[PDB]
Each structure stands twice: as C-alpha cells, then as structure tokens.
Design an enzyme around this catalytic site. Structure first.
Site, PDB file in Angstrom:
ATOM      1  N   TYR A 165     -14.270 -40.477 -46.746  1.00 54.21           N
ATOM      2  CA  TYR A 165     -13.013 -39.736 -46.922  1.00 54.21           C
ATOM      3  C   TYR A 165     -12.308 -39.705 -45.555  1.00 54.21           C
ATOM      4  CZ  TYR A 165      -9.832 -35.805 -47.139  1.00 54.21           C
ATOM      5  OH  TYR A 165      -8.714 -35.013 -47.032  1.00 54.21           O
TER       6      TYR A 165
ATOM      7  N   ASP B  19      -5.742 -26.307 -49.259  1.00 54.09           N
ATOM      8  CA  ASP B  19      -5.553 -26.847 -47.896  1.00 54.09           C
ATOM      9  C   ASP B  19      -4.224 -26.285 -47.345  1.00 54.09           C
ATOM     10  OD1 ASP B  19      -5.012 -28.448 -45.505  1.00 54.09           O
ATOM     11  OD2 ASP B  19      -5.902 -30.253 -46.388  1.00 54.09           O
TER      12      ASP B  19
ATOM     13  N   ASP C  71      -8.061 -28.857 -35.632  1.00 51.12           N
ATOM     14  CA  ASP C  71      -9.474 -28.821 -35.966  1.00 51.12           C
ATOM     15  C   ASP C  71      -9.672 -28.201 -37.352  1.00 51.12           C
ATOM     16  OD1 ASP C  71     -10.526 -29.888 -33.425  1.00 51.12           O
ATOM     17  OD2 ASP C  71      -9.866 -27.884 -32.676  1.00 51.12           O
TER      18      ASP C  71
ATOM     19  N   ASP D 196     -13.865 -29.277 -43.760  1.00 52.29           N
ATOM     20  CA  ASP D 196     -13.756 -29.441 -45.188  1.00 52.29           C
ATOM     21  C   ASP D 196     -15.090 -29.092 -45.875  1.00 52.29           C
ATOM     22  OD1 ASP D 196     -11.121 -30.260 -45.071  1.00 52.29           O
ATOM     23  OD2 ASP D 196     -11.517 -32.300 -45.864  1.00 52.29           O
TER      24      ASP D 196
END
Lengths: 128, 128
Positions: free
Chosen positions: B16, B40, B100, B103
């Site tokens: 990813y 997100d 920064d 996930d």
C-alpha cells in the site's frame, strides 16, 4: 482534564511510555478508567478492569528491568484517540529481546484510557 | 489469498505504501474491498465504497509528486489486521511539507482492505 485535546493525547501517551519504561505499575493502572479494556496483542481477547489490567502489567514489568521508548511521534486525533510506535526491551532467558509495538488508545471524558490496543506479532520480536 | 496471515499483512501494508509513493490510484483502489471504509484523519466521518475512496486518493495524489515511506516496521496481528508508521511528503504551496501518520487496517477474507484508519493531526505536519 476533560476529553483530551490532540495536544493532551500526545502528552498522555508519551507519559504512558515513560511509566512503562520505569516500570511503575500502580501509576500505569491509575492511567486507566475503572472498566477499561486492554487488547495486547490485538487479536487476543480483551482483559477488563483495573485488577486484570494490574495483573497484566505485573506479569510484564515485575522483573523491574524492562525498558520502553517511542520510536516516532504520537499521532493524535481530535476525538480523544491516538496511536504511537515504540520499542520494548525485555530479557527473556538471560537474552536481551526487543519488541516493536504500535499502541492505539481511546481516552474518556476525564482523560483516562478507556481502550488500549497493542499491535504486534512474534515477527516484531528480535532475540538478537 | 484468504484472510491474510501476519506475514501477508506485513506484505500488503508495505505494498500500500509503495503504491502511495508512486501515486498509483487505480492500484490503491484495487486493494480495497467493494464497500470498504476509510477514516482519514481518524476522527472524521468515514468515506464509503470504491468510488468515494478513488475520489479521495485523487484529491491526495493526483499532483503526482507526493512521496510516502515506512518509518518503522508493520505491526501485524493474527486476525488479518496491522498498523504501520509512515511519513508522507507533499508540496502544499510550493513549500515542501511532511506528515507523520499511523495507519490501522483490517483485511477481509480475500485479502482486501475492509477498513483503513489513518491517525494524524495538524501537529504531525511539518512545513519546514
């Protein structure tokens, strides 16, 4: 404190790592709400409540020589959550070991940890 | 693939990041299940489904010059989940920026991303 701000989450998560690093168990347990859960490793069933959480930290830190340190910045949210990368050093049969971990935490409206989820698998272990 | 093993989660998450780094949008969208969600930053409402997810990645990567790289190892689980720390470089007004991010992802029984949660706040940004 109320629901922690992103700034406050950074502080708290960083604090948690400091308390692991010195191995202060009652101070760690005091960070957790009454009826908080811990999933460690994430994928295992949660432990529940301050007594089970205390026992867990005793099984982990009651040697007194574990060390822990952030290995990058805390990533915080605006809804009282954050995630952080760290490394735990442990001696597991007179052999130093290191474990790389990411904790995800959710704080309650008093600034206590409501949930902690510690992401790691055996390949994040290094016997060295 | 079936539910990914811890080994496979490492691979997929790492992949990813590689696809973000080259800015391949259809390849990123193809990693997601049909009806996957993306949060997100974590704390915002989820986007739903491969069309909304594609639009999201277009708004993020359709300059073509974003870069992304792991800043520590993927931490994987035995239940098809993992978390990883990375840094995204973007130019946000002819000014380089770095963000920064951590996930957290959960994979389905075919190896597609079911949920993605990207932990970060404005203080994880560095305009520099």
């Amino acid at each position: 404190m109320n629901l922690p701000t992103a700034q406050e989450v950074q502080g708290l998560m960083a604090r948690y790592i400091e308390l692991v690093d010195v191995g202060d168990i009652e101070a760690i347990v005091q960070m957790y709400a009454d009826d908080a859960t811990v999933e460690d490793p994430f994928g295992q069933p949660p432990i529940h409540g301050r007594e089970q959480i205390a026992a867990f930290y005793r099984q982990g830190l009651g040697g007194g020589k574990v060390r822990a340190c952030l290995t990058g910045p805390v990533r915080a949210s605006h809804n009282g959550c954050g995630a952080m990368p760290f490394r735990v050093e442990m001696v597991w049969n007179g052999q130093p070991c290191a474990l790389d971990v990411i904790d995800v935490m959710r704080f309650d409206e008093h600034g206590r940890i409501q949930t902690a989820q510690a992401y790691w698998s055996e390949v994040n272990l290094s016997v060295r």
